[PDB]
Amino acid sequence: EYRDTYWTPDYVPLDTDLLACFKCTGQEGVPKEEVAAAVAAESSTGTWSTVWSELLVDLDFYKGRCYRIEDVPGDKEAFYAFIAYPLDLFEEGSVTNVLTSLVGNVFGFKALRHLRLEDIRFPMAFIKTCPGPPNGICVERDRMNKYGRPLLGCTIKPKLGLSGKNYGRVVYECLRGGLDFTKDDENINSQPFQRWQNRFEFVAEAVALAQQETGEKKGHYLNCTAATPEEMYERAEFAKELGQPIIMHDYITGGFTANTGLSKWCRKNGMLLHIHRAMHAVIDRHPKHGIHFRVLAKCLRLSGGDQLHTGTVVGKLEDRQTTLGFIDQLRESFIPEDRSRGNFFDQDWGSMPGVFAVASGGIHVWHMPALVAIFGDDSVLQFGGGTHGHPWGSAAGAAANRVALEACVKARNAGREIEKESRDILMEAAKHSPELAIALETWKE
Amino acid sequence: TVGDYQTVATLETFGFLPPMTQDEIYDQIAYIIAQGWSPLIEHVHPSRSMATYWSYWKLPFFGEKDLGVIVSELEACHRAYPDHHVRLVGYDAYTQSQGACFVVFEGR
Amino acid sequence: TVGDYQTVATLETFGFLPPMTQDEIYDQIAYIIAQGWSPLIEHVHPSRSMATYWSYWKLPFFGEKDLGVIVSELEACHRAYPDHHVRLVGYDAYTQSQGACFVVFEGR
Ligand SMILES: O=C(O)[C@@](O)(COP(=O)(O)O)[C@H](O)[C@H](O)COP(=O)(O)O
Ligand SMILES: [Mg+2]
């Protein structure tokens, strides 16, 4: 027991292996090969002890090995440890198992002061066992008939207080004014002041009465997060019986077991799934501890869900290169290796559909040319007060964003620089709309 | 009256903006072609506007690199059907999706 | 003919009584305000009369203590929509309910 039986510098990973990257720094004095070897051991076999039983098995086959050590640029005591795991260690189509194995124990191990899971390469043999998105980008655009432009959303406020009927009152106003989605807030489950069978039924009327008046398909992500899985399926089946197209779930707080059961219920029943990344900043935020959100985005694309919050837009989450890095991984089918965007591995998804990139949290009308240049067309833009905060109401507010979005698209197509000519793509649009002309005066500038 | 917003019936994309000039159609068509997509013209009676399949005209312009033909194939569909919407589409063969979809003529 | 009662189509409250005088609207509005409720004006086409949501005008008068403004905001909704019902509502914020709900103008 001293390791360097897990430090294989000559090994060439198979195409069936599951690779991983760790940004690590260990105790003072111990060489890097030993401390990365300890990460190799404690995340697979966590050994060698001395037992009679550990000789009943060929343990050189199930061992995880560290084949490369690289230095973090800009830091000295840290390093990158690339570790390879055999495909036999994991259950097929189980993402609850792949994290329980990797991050289940190594984070408590004592010799490491700092450890961060940065990336994972999944092999094509593992990807094909997982369910994946229930629909994807190209199937959602088919079912909703929305082409050539990003989608628009709003989150109903006040979060706390509205009855089932006043809720549907405010849902009806934002939809009938230009948006195509509204959102249940993450808190809204089934509170005493608004039970869920009363919210579900009055929203179903506000959606169906705005779909007919505008002549466009509209929706509202109803929150089917619950305390039990029997309760979650019950809300999902209520929502499908009311004829609704889309629902919502919280995968970090409700768990991957529930998220994957819901994601495969949506394929047999033809529903869409919107995912909220609640309690992500507890894990992902600090730059030396925990998991990067990139890895929790890959696990989400593997488990299910057609849209995922990426946020956060004030004025954005901020670098842009890191964000554009895992937006590629949510959407593309093959992603090369680029260190600037923090992709440590070449990742191939084959034919697995992409996931919509939802931008959120505090957008206003002057942010459109920067959110169309950065995110592209396979994005959803969700404001909370951008729609509701308009001096004339919630329908005149939605009518101002839908005019400023379609003016930024049609100027991107025609070869103009949207993120650079933003003021004449907007002031020349307000000449033909008094709803936007007053919105540009409020949220100046 | 201000501010009393009235719900308006629209098509979908570019519906909230005024009708496009001839010069705007040029640049949208040029963008559609420069992405490598295939143009495609449709039309319906404005009452059947929410059908899942409109009506072709005539076949998608597979591998057409000239926008001076599509601006003349749009007045033909319009003159032949002067009470129809005239849509303009951009077929993407690798993704099996549509990169563009906006009504050009509204239906006299 | 007596006594042959004919079923009549009504709205709901105060529907069986004759249309209200201007002075009656004063006292109902004054009662609505004196309970602490918020006035709210709606209208629909008399055919869409059984919709669950009518149409606002323009925003609920949150914290308005003057009934000389609401009697003038009722002729505005009527003149702007001379073929609509004009309802008068009283929003209760603590109970999340409506303490009043009666049609004022019937739709010319
Ligand atoms: O802080 C702001 O600027 C807003 O309140 C908008 O103000 P205005 O209403 O004055 O525009 C943001 O919408 C919310 O903070 C979060 O967004 P949301 O609630 O949409 O998720
Ligand atoms: Mg902002």
Side-chain angles (χ1 to χ4, degrees):
Chain A
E1 189 32 87
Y2 153 74
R3 280 143 183 151
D4 286 41
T5 91
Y6 297 74
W7 160 241
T8 54
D10 33 52
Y11 178 82
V12 200
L14 298 213
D15 269 274
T16 54
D17 294 330
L18 182 145
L19 319 184
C21 196
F22 285 112
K23 187 215 314 162
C24 204
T25 148
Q27 304 297 47
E28 228 45 22
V30 310
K32 312 151 138 337
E33 294 87 318
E34 282 39 32
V35 63
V39 186
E42 281 329 92
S43 10
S44 74
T45 47
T47 211
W48 269 264
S49 212
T50 28
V51 192
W52 76 278
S53 189
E54 296 187 314
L55 271 126
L56 292 141
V57 171
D58 187 25
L59 271 179
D60 265 358
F61 182 42
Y62 295 101
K63 136 186 101 171
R65 46 220 93 189
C66 167
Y67 56 94
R68 195 148 76 223
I69 275 299
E70 280 169 65
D71 321 349
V72 154
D75 189 359
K76 283 60 53 196
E77 303 23 279
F79 54 114
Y80 286 133
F82 300 30
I83 294 139
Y85 301 92
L87 180 83
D88 285 23
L89 321 190
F90 317 103
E91 205 199 349
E92 296 113 343
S94 190
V95 195
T96 325
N97 194 167
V98 120
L99 286 191
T100 270
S101 302
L102 269 177
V103 307
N105 165 315
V106 61
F107 276 92
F109 174 67
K110 268 85 186 130
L112 319 149
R113 307 187 337 229
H114 301 324
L115 181 80
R116 190 156 164 93
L117 190 51
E118 294 232 277
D119 219 285
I120 302 174
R121 212 283 313 270
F122 299 50
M124 274 293 327
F126 185 78
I127 295 187
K128 299 226 48 127
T129 64
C130 281
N135 307 79
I137 290 167
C138 307
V139 168
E140 189 190 292
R141 309 203 102 138
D142 291 354
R143 315 195 71 191
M144 299 295 296
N145 291 292
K146 311 210 188 248
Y147 296 149
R149 59 155 255 235
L151 308 187
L152 269 147
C154 187
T155 286
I156 298 312
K157 312 241 156 280
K159 10 174 52 196
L160 281 167
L162 293 165
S163 30
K165 180 153 218 179
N166 284 274
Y167 209 74
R169 188 65 212 199
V170 255
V171 168
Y172 164 70
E173 291 285 5
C174 286
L175 283 183
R176 79 155 185 110
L179 306 150
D180 39 61
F181 289 128
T182 49
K183 207 196 83 151
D184 265 39
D185 195 59
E186 35 144 70
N187 299 20
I188 321 304
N189 270 7
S190 169
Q191 268 79 320
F193 60 81
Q194 181 206 86
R195 305 275 159 206
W196 68 269
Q197 310 99 326
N198 295 111
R199 182 203 11 181
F200 279 23
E201 72 162 307
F202 283 86
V203 151
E205 285 175 357
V207 172
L209 164 64
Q211 184 179 238
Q212 148 219 303
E213 285 188 53
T214 44
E216 292 182 348
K217 273 181 242 269
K218 311 223 164 268
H220 179 99
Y221 331 138
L222 293 150
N223 197 353
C224 311
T225 315
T228 356
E230 300 90 55
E231 277 159 54
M232 182 187 62
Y233 295 131
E234 203 209 333
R235 299 174 190 197
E237 284 162 294
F238 194 49
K240 171 215 218 271
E241 155 216 316
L242 288 175
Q244 293 292 340
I246 181 159
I247 53 185
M248 202 184 53
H249 177 288
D250 262 316
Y251 75 128
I252 289 182
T253 65
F256 285 82
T257 292
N259 190 63
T260 305
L262 194 62
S263 164
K264 298 164 20 166
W265 179 98
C266 287
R267 196 171 244 165
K268 68 179 176 173
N269 293 96
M271 187 130 335
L272 311 149
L273 194 43
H274 173 257
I275 304 295
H276 190 1
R277 59 153 184 191
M279 209 209 17
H280 76 272
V282 167
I283 311 150
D284 294 9
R285 192 159 149 267
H286 292 273
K288 306 158 89 70
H289 315 140
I291 304 154
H292 202 273
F293 180 71
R294 163 169 25 180
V295 175
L296 298 154
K298 305 221 211 154
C299 304
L300 195 270
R301 189 176 171 167
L302 274 198
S303 168
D306 313 78
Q307 330 202 67
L308 165 73
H309 279 220
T310 309
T312 206
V313 195
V314 357
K316 205 194 42 169
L317 191 143
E318 305 293 33
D319 202 45
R320 300 173 45 255
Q321 285 308 325
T322 298
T323 42
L324 305 178
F326 62 88
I327 285 190
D328 275 4
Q329 308 244 327
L330 253 116
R331 294 214 286 226
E332 314 310 332
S333 211
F334 170 72
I335 309 104
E337 193 221 84
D338 193 52
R339 278 317 174 54
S340 328
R341 293 141 161 249
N343 299 251
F344 295 85
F345 296 153
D346 286 335
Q347 177 64 353
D348 205 89
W349 295 87
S351 45
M352 187 182 260
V355 176
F356 265 100
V358 178
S360 199
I363 315 112
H364 80 98
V365 68
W366 294 83
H367 291 4
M368 289 281 185
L371 269 96
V372 175
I374 286 14
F375 277 77
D377 281 13
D378 299 351
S379 307
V380 171
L381 315 158
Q382 267 194 117
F383 340 112
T387 290
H388 297 130
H390 184 144
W392 297 350
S394 300
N401 315 298
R402 184 74 181 292
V403 161
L405 179 77
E406 291 171 296
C408 287
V409 190
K410 115 176 197 158
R412 182 246 341 227
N413 310 85
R416 323 186 30 172
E417 298 130 76
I418 56 176
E419 186 170 33
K420 190 212 167 89
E421 295 192 333
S422 334
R423 127 158 321 169
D424 310 89
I425 290 141
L426 286 160
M427 285 185 317
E428 303 260 288
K431 260 134 204 272
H432 289 178
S433 190
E435 277 79 332
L436 168 68
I438 219 203
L440 288 152
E441 218 3 72
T442 335
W443 299 288
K444 253 219 187 298
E445 26 352 88
Chain B
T1 166
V2 301
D4 176 69
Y5 173 78
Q6 247 167 59
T7 308
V8 298
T10 49
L11 286 323
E12 185 102 281
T13 316
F14 303 153
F16 282 48
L17 324 160
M20 263 183 224
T21 325
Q22 274 309 125
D23 202 329
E24 301 223 306
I25 313 182
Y26 282 176
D27 291 77
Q28 299 301 310
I29 289 171
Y31 161 87
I32 287 185
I33 284 173
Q35 309 269 318
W37 296 326
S38 288
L40 185 269
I41 310 198
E42 310 184 283
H43 61 337
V44 278
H45 191 278
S47 65
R48 285 166 34 80
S49 157
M50 270 283 272
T52 300
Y53 301 109
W54 286 21
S55 320
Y56 270 3
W57 171 287
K58 332 230 190 61
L59 288 167
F61 289 72
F62 287 122
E64 182 48 293
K65 292 330 204 254
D66 180 85
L67 57 159
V69 163
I70 316 198
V71 285
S72 37
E73 217 67 18
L74 269 166
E75 319 149 18
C77 189
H78 183 58
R79 233 173 359 247
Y81 292 92
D83 2 354
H84 275 47
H85 300 343
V86 190
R87 199 198 264 160
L88 186 40
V89 183
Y91 261 131
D92 193 11
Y94 310 92
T95 64
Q96 278 311 247
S97 212
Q98 268 152 89
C101 204
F102 64 106
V103 159
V104 181
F105 292 13
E106 230 285 325
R108 323 201 61 194
Chain C
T1 166
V2 301
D4 175 69
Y5 173 78
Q6 247 167 59
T7 308
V8 298
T10 49
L11 286 323
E12 185 102 281
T13 316
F14 303 153
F16 282 48
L17 324 160
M20 263 183 224
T21 325
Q22 274 309 125
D23 202 328
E24 301 223 306
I25 313 182
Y26 282 176
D27 291 77
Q28 299 301 310
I29 289 171
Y31 161 87
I32 287 185
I33 284 173
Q35 309 269 318
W37 296 326
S38 288
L40 185 269
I41 310 198
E42 310 185 283
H43 61 337
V44 278
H45 191 278
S47 65
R48 285 166 34 80
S49 157
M50 270 283 272
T52 300
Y53 301 109
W54 286 21
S55 320
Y56 270 3
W57 171 287
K58 332 229 190 61
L59 288 167
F61 289 72
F62 287 122
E64 182 48 293
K65 292 330 204 254
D66 180 85
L67 57 159
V69 163
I70 316 198
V71 285
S72 37
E73 217 67 18
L74 269 166
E75 319 149 18
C77 189
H78 183 58
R79 233 173 359 247
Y81 292 92
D83 2 354
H84 275 47
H85 300 344
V86 190
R87 199 198 264 160
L88 186 40
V89 183
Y91 261 131
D92 193 11
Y94 310 92
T95 64
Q96 278 311 247
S97 212
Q98 268 152 89
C101 203
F102 64 106
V103 159
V104 181
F105 292 13
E106 230 285 325
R108 323 201 61 194

